[PDB]
Amino acid sequence: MIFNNFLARLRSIPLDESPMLQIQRDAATIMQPYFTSNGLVTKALEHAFQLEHIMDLTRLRCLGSLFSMLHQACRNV
Amino acid sequence: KDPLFRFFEREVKMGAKLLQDVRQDLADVVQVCEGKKKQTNYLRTLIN
Amino acid sequence: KLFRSLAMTKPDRQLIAQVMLYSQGFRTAEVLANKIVPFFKLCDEQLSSQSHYDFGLRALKSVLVSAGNVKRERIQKIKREKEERGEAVDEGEIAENLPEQEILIQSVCETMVPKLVAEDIPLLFSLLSDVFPGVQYHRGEMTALREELKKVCQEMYLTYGDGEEVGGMWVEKVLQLYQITQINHGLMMVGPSGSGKSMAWRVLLKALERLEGVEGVAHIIDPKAISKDHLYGTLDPNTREW
Amino acid sequence: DVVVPTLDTVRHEALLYTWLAEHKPLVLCGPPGSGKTMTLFSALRALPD
Amino acid sequence: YLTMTQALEARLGGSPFGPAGTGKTESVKALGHQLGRFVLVFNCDETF
Amino acid sequence: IFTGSADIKHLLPVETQRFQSISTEFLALMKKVSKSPLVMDVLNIQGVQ
Amino acid sequence: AQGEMALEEFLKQIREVWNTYELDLVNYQNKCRLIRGWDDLFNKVKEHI
Ligand SMILES: Nc1ncnc2c1ncn2[C@@H]1O[C@H](COP(=O)(O)OP(=O)(O)OP(=O)(O)O)[C@@H](O)[C@H]1O
Ligand SMILES: Nc1ncnc2c1ncn2[C@@H]1O[C@H](COP(=O)(O)OP(=O)(O)O)[C@@H](O)[C@H]1O
Ligand SMILES: Nc1ncnc2c1ncn2[C@@H]1O[C@H](COP(=O)(O)OP(=O)(O)O)[C@@H](O)[C@H]1O
Ligand SMILES: [Mg+2]
Ligand SMILES: [Mg+2]
């Protein structure tokens, strides 16, 4: 559900406020197979839950950081 | 459907949970005493 | 020494249930009470211990009040459906041909299921079957409310679902929260950080606004972000001004 | 003000830049004197606004 | 009711105590309404 | 003056940063002008004067 | 009627000029898109006033 919301916001809201939104849709299309159940992100997250961290690990912290820097990747494009 | 099984299931859940809690705390204590690991705030409280 | 003190520790729950089911019009009030009070005792001392569980006199009182309301609305619905299907409405047979046990189970489910953790629900239903054999609970399916929820979810990029589909549990929680909102004037959403609570109540508020035509205004207050004086108010120590 | 570049230093510069870019809040955790504030300030030197 | 009326006759206040949910405030309100009195409920705190 | 001469950054740092900020603001505003070269649209830019 | 057509014609002329007038923009070292044509613009504004 979180992945779906992230992808929908990427394909809907431009980062500037359109070429930016077209880049967003293309990037969302590329990352779509990874953002799925039993995908790369899900397995990586459930594995990271087994590692030790300086602070307590929360799923949404990692997900929000990931979405932030993916938005930055779109900005870089 | 067995109330007895429900009660014993709750009991074993609670007992096991507190069991690994205590065992992990004691393991951390013995590692601290051997100098293997640093003493944390929770570990400081537990030792004191 | 200026007060006479009285210890009231154990209220007479069974008598309260008996009398206040007898008054509401339940003919099997004795059996209903003798089945419902031990059911609450069993819920208290058979389900998993959680900090957000209450099975005291307040819960039973709310259950019985909701049971009376549900019986009234079922009688109204039976009258309405009979009038549009024929002319045979009389109070005697409607009262006689009325599933009081089903009404009580419906009220109990509507008020207790939302508070339960995932693994306790089968225990609750097994207890209900043991104490109320044969009686089943079938929640009404709110078509218009679900449609409004789906529209709001699409508008705000939320993942609406139904049944076992992805997001079905979230919509179930929203519907349960709506039911409790109707029943209670005090609500509390317990759950780990980022379980969808904020978005759940926001979506429900928007759906209610679009459905009933009365628009909802929500004031969000962080009680611990300010001192209690700034939260409730101050009585001026010198001028006695509030 | 001077910063000697290092593998950890440049990696943290990139991560801080990609996090502060959208004005997302963030926290640097580490032992005292590790270089958290200097990393933050060297990251802000790349953001004049 | 017996204890509270005995307290009232002695011109003494009443103090029903116990765990929450036993119907103390409601009992006092019901007794007050039975005697046709105006009963005001105050949720006391440290600011009183 | 600011871009062409490389010694000014070494010799006049803070006002180099200030001019850089002014240049970014100026470029953004005149990009807004460029996408809508109409006189009235430029006049209708919020807080333009 | 025929006399007042002069004033309405002036109003329409001013309206159409200012709805079709475009700023003259030319590239500047591939860095920005600067504006020229200050004299004619100023003359148009003052003559319309
Ligand atoms: N039904 C849903 N479908 C898709 N995304 C959702 C849904 N519900 C919540 N989210 C998203 O997942 C995150 C959960 O945040 P939300 O505020 O809903 O949860 P919460 O349990 O109220 O959080 P908290 O108590 O930690 O503040 C948010 O990023 C939100 O946008
Ligand atoms: N890569 C580096 N290059 C230059 N100096 C460094 C580097 N890493 C650490 N230092 C030195 O270590 C110190 C870090 O202290 P500081 O950043 O103030 O700690 P904190 O961020 O915890 O307050 C700085 O004074 C800096 O001189
Ligand atoms: N004798 C009674 N008859 C009917 N309801 C009762 C009785 N005693 C308690 N209750 C119910 O219990 C609920 C909680 O009682 P309350 O007085 O608020 O608890 P407390 O004793 O903690 O103040 C009330 O809603 C009230 O209706
Ligand atoms: Mg929340
Ligand atoms: Mg009370």
Swiss-Prot record, chain A:
**Compartment annotation:** Cytoplasm, Cytoskeleton
The highest taxon in the source lineage is Eukaryota
The entry's family comment says: Belongs to the dynein heavy chain family.
**What role does this protein play?**
Cytoplasmic dynein 1 acts as a motor for the intracellular retrograde motility of vesicles and organelles along microtubules. Dynein has ATPase activity; the force-producing power stroke is thought to occur on release of ADP. Plays a role in mitotic spindle assembly and metaphase plate congression.
Q: What is known of its domains?
A: Dynein heavy chains probably consist of an N-terminal stem (which binds cargo and interacts with other dynein components), and the head or motor domain. The motor contains six tandemly-linked AAA domains in the head, which form a ring. A stalk-like structure (formed by two of the coiled coil domains) protrudes between AAA 4 and AAA 5 and terminates in a microtubule-binding site. A seventh domain may also contribute to this ring; it is not clear whether the N-terminus or the C-terminus forms this extra domain.
> Quaternary state and partners of this protein?
Homodimer. The cytoplasmic dynein 1 complex consists of two catalytic heavy chains (HCs) and a number of non-catalytic subunits presented by intermediate chains (ICs), light intermediate chains (LICs) and light chains (LCs); the composition seems to vary in respect to the IC, LIC and LC composition. The heavy chain homodimer serves as a scaffold for the probable homodimeric assembly of the respective non-catalytic subunits. The ICs and LICs bind directly to the HC dimer and dynein LCs assemble on the IC dimer. Interacts with DYNC1LI1; DYNC1LI1 and DYNC1LI2 bind mutually exclusive to DYNC1H1.
Disorder named in the UniProt entry: Charcot-Marie-Tooth disease, axonal, type 2O: An axonal form of Charcot-Marie-Tooth disease, a disorder of the peripheral nervous system, characterized by progressive weakness and atrophy, initially of the peroneal muscles and later of the distal muscles of the arms. Charcot-Marie-Tooth disease is classified in two main groups on the basis of electrophysiologic properties and histopathology: primary peripheral demyelinating neuropathies (designated CMT1 when they are dominantly inherited) and primary peripheral axonal neuropathies (CMT2).
**Identification of the protein by name:** Cytoplasmic dynein 1 heavy chain 1
Q: Which gene encodes it?
A: DYNC1H1
Which residues of the whole protein does the chain here span? 2373 to 2469 of 4646
Curated annotation (Swiss-Prot), chain G:
Which positions make up the signal peptide?
Answer: none
Name where it's found: Cytoplasm, Cytoskeleton
Membrane spanning residue stretches: none
Q: How is the subunit organization of this protein annotated in UniProt?
A: Homodimer. The cytoplasmic dynein 1 complex consists of two catalytic heavy chains (HCs) and a number of non-catalytic subunits presented by intermediate chains (ICs), light intermediate chains (LICs) and light chains (LCs); the composition seems to vary in respect to the IC, LIC and LC composition. The heavy chain homodimer serves as a scaffold for the probable homodimeric assembly of the respective non-catalytic subunits. The ICs and LICs bind directly to the HC dimer and dynein LCs assemble on the IC dimer. Interacts with DYNC1LI1; DYNC1LI1 and DYNC1LI2 bind mutually exclusive to DYNC1H1.
Can you quote the domain comment? Dynein heavy chains probably consist of an N-terminal stem (which binds cargo and interacts with other dynein components), and the head or motor domain. The motor contains six tandemly-linked AAA domains in the head, which form a ring. A stalk-like structure (formed by two of the coiled coil domains) protrudes between AAA 4 and AAA 5 and terminates in a microtubule-binding site. A seventh domain may also contribute to this ring; it is not clear whether the N-terminus or the C-terminus forms this extra domain.
- Associated clinical condition: Charcot-Marie-Tooth disease, axonal, type 2O: An axonal form of Charcot-Marie-Tooth disease, a disorder of the peripheral nervous system, characterized by progressive weakness and atrophy, initially of the peroneal muscles and later of the distal muscles of the arms. Charcot-Marie-Tooth disease is classified in two main groups on the basis of electrophysiologic properties and histopathology: primary peripheral demyelinating neuropathies (designated CMT1 when they are dominantly inherited) and primary peripheral axonal neuropathies (CMT2). Cortical dysplasia, complex, with other brain malformations 13: An autosomal dominant disorder characterized by global developmental delay with impaired intellectual development. Some patients show signs of peripheral neuropathy, such as abnormal gait and hyporeflexia. CDCBM13 is associated with variable neuronal migration defects resulting in cortical malformations.
> Which family is it part of?
Belongs to the dynein heavy chain family.
Function noted in UniProt: Cytoplasmic dynein 1 acts as a motor for the intracellular retrograde motility of vesicles and organelles along microtubules. Dynein has ATPase activity; the force-producing power stroke is thought to occur on release of ADP. Plays a role in mitotic spindle assembly and metaphase plate congression.
Q: What is this protein called?
A: Cytoplasmic dynein 1 heavy chain 1
Q: Which gene encodes it?
A: DYNC1H1
Full protein segment contained here = 1453 to 1501 of 4646
